[PDB]
Structure formats: C-alpha cells, structure tokens
DNA sequence: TTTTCACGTGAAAAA
DNA sequence: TTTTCACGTGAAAAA
C-alpha cells in the first residue's frame, strides 16, 4: 500500500485494541472528514522496514519502542515535534523511551510489562518462586490440570527468567549501550534457560507451546498460571476464569526481570499526512476519552498520559504490572535490538526442542546478537569483486577456446580447456585434476 | 512436535470451529480417558508436509481435500479403511474427494463453496452481474460506503470470477486430470482477471485488501457485499448487520464458478494413535452431536454426514452455498494443486498491484502451475556435479602453485595462477583477462 | 578490515 | 533430458 493525501492508515499489532482504536478513528473522521483505517497485519514490525524504505506502508505504525531506533536509523520515521505543553502531559520516562540520537521519533502510548496471571479457583496462593513450579505441576497433573503455560515461541516471554540471575542484552555504561557487550551467554542466562529446558525435560511444559495455545489453556481453566501482558486481560474477563495478576516468581532468590516496552506510534516519513497524523495522535488518541476507547477494547497497561494513568493506576492489575516493570528494565531502542531478539528467539526455541544444548544455543546467540550487519556498500563491494573475478576468468577461457586450437570436443566445460592449456605448457593432469610436470 | 501414545493432537485452520471441535475432544476424553488438544497454527497446510516427512506433526490434520493428494504422494497419510457401514453414512461424492490412487486418504467432513454475502439494509436487491458493481459502488461511495470487499490475497476468492468465462486449473479428459494442460492463461481467465484489475484501477477495490480487512468492513457495515464461505456467518451473526447469502454474480452472462472444497481429516502416517484417531473421527466427530458442536461454533457448510445434512440443508444459507457449489467444480486433489495455487496467487497479487500486466502475470502463472518440481535425486545430482567440478579445478591449481615456480605474489587468487600458466604456454593475458597469442 | 573459494540452485543451451 | 556457468553471500584466512 501507499499513503494518500487526505486519509489515514494505521498499523497495530493484532493483540492490541484495534477495534477501540478504530472508534477513535471514526471520531477523527466525524470531526475533520478524514477517513482512518486501522489494520493489524501479521509481522507488521518486519513488514514496515521493508515497505517504508521506498515510501510504502502506513501513515502511522504502532509497536513497542524497542523497534523504533532501527526505523529511525534507516530514515523511516518523521521527527516528532510536540509543543512543550503537550510533552508535559506524558511521563518524562516514556518520552525517553522514544528518544533516539537526541530526537523524538514516536509518540509514547502506554507502558507494558509481563506479569504472572493465575487462576484463583485452582490456585488460591500463587507460587512465589520458579523453583516450586515442578512440584506444583505434579500435584495439579493428578487433577488433570497443569501448573503453567506461556508462549515459548517469542523470547519476550522467557526473557524475565533468563535475566533474573544475571542475563542481559547489551551492557549499559557511561550513558550508552555497548553493542559489543552482550550478556546472553553468562552464568545467569544459562541458569535461567536451563531451568526452562528442565521444565520441558521433566514434562511440566511443552516446547511447542505458543501464544494461542497458552491463552486457550488458561482461559479454558486447563492450566493454573500463564505469563502475559495487560492486553490479555479482556479475553480472560469474558472467560469463566476468576484470575489474579501478580508479581512474577523469583528465580534463585532474585526477581524475574521483564523487558519493559512502551507501545509507541511513529509517523511514516513518507506520509503526506504528517500534520493530520499529529492531530490524530495528540488531540484524539492521547486524550482521556481516546485512550479509554482503546483501553476498553484491550487494556493498554500503564498509559503515558498522566491524567488517565491517574485513573488506571487505581486498578490492582495495573499496580501489579508496574511492580513487575520496576523490577525489569526499559528496553533499549537501538538498531541492534532486532538482531538481539532474533538471536535469543533462535536460542530459546532450539534449546526447548533439544536441537541444541543450552550452552550451544546461548553461545551462538551471543555471537549472533553482537554481529554487525554488513552495510549495503559492503555487500555491493563483495558482489562486484566476484562478478569481476568471474569475468576475468571467462575472458581468458573465451580466448583460449577461440585461438587455442586445442582439439576439444564440440561441447566441454572450462576445466577441459584448462587441462588442454596445462598439457600445452608441459603439464599432465589426471582425471581428478591431480597435476604435475 | 511429536505424536505420542495415548494423546490426540489435531490441527485445524483458524477460520473453522476449533472451539466446538475441542468440545468434541473433551467428550472423547471423558468417555475414553484420551486427552485431545485442538490447535490452529498458521500456515498449517505448509507446515504439515515439512514436519510429517520426519515423523513430527499432529495426529490429525484438517484441511480442504485439495491438499491431501500431495501429502499422500509423499507418504504422509495413513490409509483410511472405514467399514462399509460407516462409508454408507457419508455422501458418495464426498468420499470421491478424498480418494487418491484408489485409496481413501482422509475422512470428508463438509462441503465448502463461496457465496455472495450482502448487507440487506444497505443493498436490499444485490446485483446479479459483476458488470454492474462499478456503478453500484459509485452510488454507494456518495453515502460513504463501498460496494464490495473480499480477500484479494488468496486466489481461492478470486478464482470464481477467473473461471467464469472459461479459466480452468487442470483440464479433465478421459477420466484424468492433465497436469500439463493448465487453463490459467486463456481468454476466459484473462477476461476475468482484467475485470478485477479494472475494479482496482477505477478505485472500486483496494489491491491490499485481505481476509481480515474485508471481514471487518462488511461486519461493521462499511461495505455492502463480501465473498466468503460458511465459516464466516458466525461473526456476521454477532454483528449488527442484516445479511443475505445468495448466488455469486455472473460475468459475461456466465455463472461464477467457485472451486468447491471438502474439509477433510487426515491421519498422520507417523501417528501411534491411528486407532484412537479413527474412533474419534468416526464415532465422535462424524455424528449428529459432534458436527453440531463444531457447526454451532463456525458453520461447516454442507456436511458429508447424511443424517445431519438433512437438518442443515434446510438453512437457506446452505441452499445458496450448494447452488454456488453446483455451478462450480470440486477441486482436484492431485499433488500439483499446491503449485497451481501458488502460481495463481502470484498472478493475482502482481496484476492487482500493477507490477505486471494481466497478460504477463497469467503467462508466468501458466508455466509456473505446470512446472515439474525436480526430484531430490535430480537436485543431488546437480549439487554433486558442481562439487566435483570445483574439486577438479582446485586440484589443478594446487598443483600449479606447488610445482609451477611461477613468479607469484605472496597472496594471489587462482586467476593469477591461470595467467602465469597462460604466459608459460605462450599467451598474453591483459588485465581484464583478454587473452591471445 | 579485505580477500579467497565454496556453495547449490537458476537461466540458458543443446539435444 | 543433461550440461554449463552465473550468481551473491558464508566460512576461513591474513592482516
Ligand atoms: O519476542 C520478541 C519481541 O518482544 C517484544 O514484543 C512484544 C511486544 O512488545 C508486546 O507488545 C506484545 O505484543 O508481545 C510481543 C511479543 O510477542 C518486542 O517489542 C519485539 O520487538 C520483539 O520482537
Ligand atoms: O487461496 C488458495 C487456497 O484455497 C483453498 O483454501 C481455502 C480453504 O479451502 C477454505 O477452507 C478457507 O479456509 O479458505 C481458504 C483460502 O484462504 C485451498 O483449499 C487451499 O489449498 C489453497 O491454498
């Protein structure tokens, strides 16, 4: 798709309140005559950098802030220039999450952290530690239930446990992240991922469990706990499950440390609707009534807007969300973040499946997360060097075939021309290429 | 994932009644003690042949019958051997859909055909012809609505119109499909795809419209018509939309000809639970109560089970589904069907997008849908040949470097060795490789 | 950092 | 059908 003057197209992930967001768009259209279409395509955070590089893609893209630095580094985002008055309405630290190289590159919407979600009827007293989950599962398995099910396909969900005893993504020092100091392969990271793999080995979890499988199992009353974010609460509300939201369990006596995301809205640099997008975000979405419409659809978490967060903070589930968030860390927004996430995703999936040992999976993840992506020009230099290497050899063989008079067959390969050349120069060449004088 | 004794795992597409099917699995568990897990992973029809070739995958896989011949040809499916008593319970033509090389390779469940779905309040008298939809849209756009929106990303939904004037997949003659006689590039197919592209060029449809975008627009009352199958009726019921289901429009005076699918359930050849899977399918799912539970979740269409279809056939929506199905054709189940579908998908997306002309897109689709996939042995033959060709050359250069005593630099490539060889044989080789005596 | 050669599949060609 | 060479990026090496 390409953006067109006079209409707004928004992309947002399918686990968020896109129907509530569309109601906001319908009000924007009611007051200004500008159509707003909300879409939730799959893998939007990978599609956006592919299409926006040439001016395609939506007017506005919603994702957690960790993806946005790479978008800005590629020039895909318009600089966000809210007046000081508007900036004041949002918590300072949410603006920090969307600051890249000194510029604001998105509007912050809401703060997301994972929490432990548990079925109060099956589990009145949720476990305080990861270590006691195996025995809790054994007791539940005898009732035809399980202890815990959560998405093992996305490393976001396993990261709180990997980070608990010391794993980290990029080390922060002297005011900046060191993209070369990755902590996915230290003792704490191994201890965390070993405990998860051990859960699978002992049949307390299944390696293939994904988002929809864990959500169905919890919301149908088949497992006593899951790990998820606020967006998941509305589907649990509609289910028959009486659930609670609480702090994640400790591991080796230390808090689980979820990576905290700030859902943010960036404006496509290629949009011809930049001013309409700013009006929609600042004056319709980032208002009490705006965030309420989206929040009523799927909870946003702790919104960046101070006036409405004063209402949402009253909610015990938000209090638990932010207890977990305080124990975690805000994600970096640096371009290297996507390479870090791909590396850890591969490591978790390969260790859970048994395709790699924990040490092997994390050793590769450390190397992959730190690997510098070759620039376009570096790839092009390499492409041209081999093109030229082939073109020089091809010219040599062309001239040998045309002037050699080598008594060759009608059809033969260049190895046979090379052989005839060798013998002409006084060499002997065996069938397998063994060559001597 | 791997199958394991005493447990049943089922894969079904996410637009079907998987919650209702899980209800049948829960009754199975109560009666026999066998746990049943229903999953709806993405792209399951592509994942299944990838994992089943090695013994992985689910116990049971649900898909339209057109995919199953390819699975059978690869040895992925157990032969289905129901007693005559049970075969008698399903319509003979549904069994024909799951017979491949003389053997039954799945249980038929239900017959699917696309119909025209229309908003009664927006459009009390739906159009009878494709040709009048442009002017209908113009009139509707003045009121802020649109005429028609349907999934343009999957060629299933566009095929009815492509086939209307004479497009076809594989020609049927003398009792067999001719895998080399593909009809995606004749005048009838060109005419139908041109009309569709013309719809986009005149702004009556959007090239990027997919399943969820079209579903949302119809169910929110923004478009007067959509094209979809029975599984979609349940979300329309829940909406505020008053809808009818009717015959697809004609094109150039001829009926739209949907490809008719038979939702079918195959048993993984690697499953250690083949007998339990037979019992689940024959005695729990393919009963009045089992199909009812699934149907109440998302309508199945015209079920293969005679006793329950006598009840369903009385729904005017099913009568319209079967009026469309009579005008269409049952899909082949031959292994080539997947190559046909990929080819047409690429043609529709490329023409709708403007990257290719309709003629250019359908020309490639014809060759693509007829292309014979090279065998494993053929690929390995080619791989080894190049391995061998490189090894011969490398041995030659190893011998020249070791015994040539050419005045070579410390580090140089094999082109520089070739050059020295040429000069020794009496040749002159310029920098770009131009070679002569 | 740049440089060499491996790698297996596609496009072109001859039959 | 088989055959040749192009193609660009990865593994290894030298610095
Ligand atoms: O799993 C890697 C993934 O983690 C985060 O994505 C979260 C997202 O922040 C949440 O809004 C929610 O949708 O769940 C996602 C995980 O499935 C990162 O934001 C993302 O970049 C990263 O790939
Ligand atoms: O679009 C190509 C696709 O068409 C059919 O898939 C249908 C399926 O039969 C229906 O049950 C429903 O789910 O919609 C699908 C289209 O998205 C073929 O059965 C399938 O093999 C083919 O790829």
Short mmCIF file of N, CA and C (backbone and C1' of nucleotides) in Angstrom, two decimals, chain A residues 373-385, chain C residues 2, chain D residues 9:
data_model
loop_
_atom_site.label_atom_id
_atom_site.label_comp_id
_atom_site.label_asym_id
_atom_site.label_seq_id
_atom_site.Cartn_x
_atom_site.Cartn_y
_atom_site.Cartn_z
N UNK A 373 25.75 -5.97 11.23
CA UNK A 373 25.16 -6.16 9.91
C UNK A 373 26.02 -5.47 8.86
N UNK A 374 26.47 -6.19 7.83
CA UNK A 374 27.24 -5.53 6.77
C UNK A 374 26.38 -4.48 6.09
N UNK A 375 27.00 -3.35 5.77
CA UNK A 375 26.30 -2.27 5.09
C UNK A 375 25.94 -2.67 3.66
N UNK A 376 25.02 -1.90 3.07
CA UNK A 376 24.70 -2.10 1.66
C UNK A 376 25.96 -2.06 0.81
N UNK A 377 26.85 -1.09 1.09
CA UNK A 377 28.03 -0.92 0.25
C UNK A 377 29.00 -2.07 0.43
N UNK A 378 29.11 -2.60 1.65
CA UNK A 378 29.98 -3.75 1.87
C UNK A 378 29.49 -4.95 1.06
N UNK A 379 28.18 -5.22 1.10
CA UNK A 379 27.63 -6.29 0.27
C UNK A 379 27.88 -6.03 -1.21
N UNK A 380 27.71 -4.78 -1.66
CA UNK A 380 27.86 -4.46 -3.07
C UNK A 380 29.32 -4.61 -3.52
N UNK A 381 30.27 -4.13 -2.71
CA UNK A 381 31.69 -4.37 -2.97
C UNK A 381 31.97 -5.86 -3.16
N UNK A 382 31.43 -6.70 -2.27
CA UNK A 382 31.70 -8.13 -2.35
C UNK A 382 31.06 -8.72 -3.60
N UNK A 383 29.84 -8.29 -3.91
CA UNK A 383 29.17 -8.76 -5.12
C UNK A 383 30.00 -8.43 -6.35
N UNK A 384 30.50 -7.20 -6.44
CA UNK A 384 31.24 -6.77 -7.62
C UNK A 384 32.58 -7.48 -7.74
N UNK A 385 33.25 -7.74 -6.61
CA UNK A 385 34.53 -8.43 -6.66
C UNK A 385 34.40 -9.81 -7.29
P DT C 2 37.04 -2.97 4.12
"O5'" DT C 2 38.06 -4.00 3.46
"C5'" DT C 2 39.31 -3.56 3.00
"C4'" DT C 2 40.14 -4.73 2.53
"C3'" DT C 2 39.65 -5.37 1.23
"O3'" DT C 2 40.76 -5.61 0.42
"C1'" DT C 2 39.80 -7.02 2.93
P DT D 9 24.00 -10.73 -1.36
"O5'" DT D 9 24.24 -11.56 -0.02
"C5'" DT D 9 23.60 -12.83 0.13
"C4'" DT D 9 24.53 -13.87 0.76
"C3'" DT D 9 25.37 -13.39 1.95
"O3'" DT D 9 25.34 -14.41 2.95
"C1'" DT D 9 26.72 -14.47 0.41
#
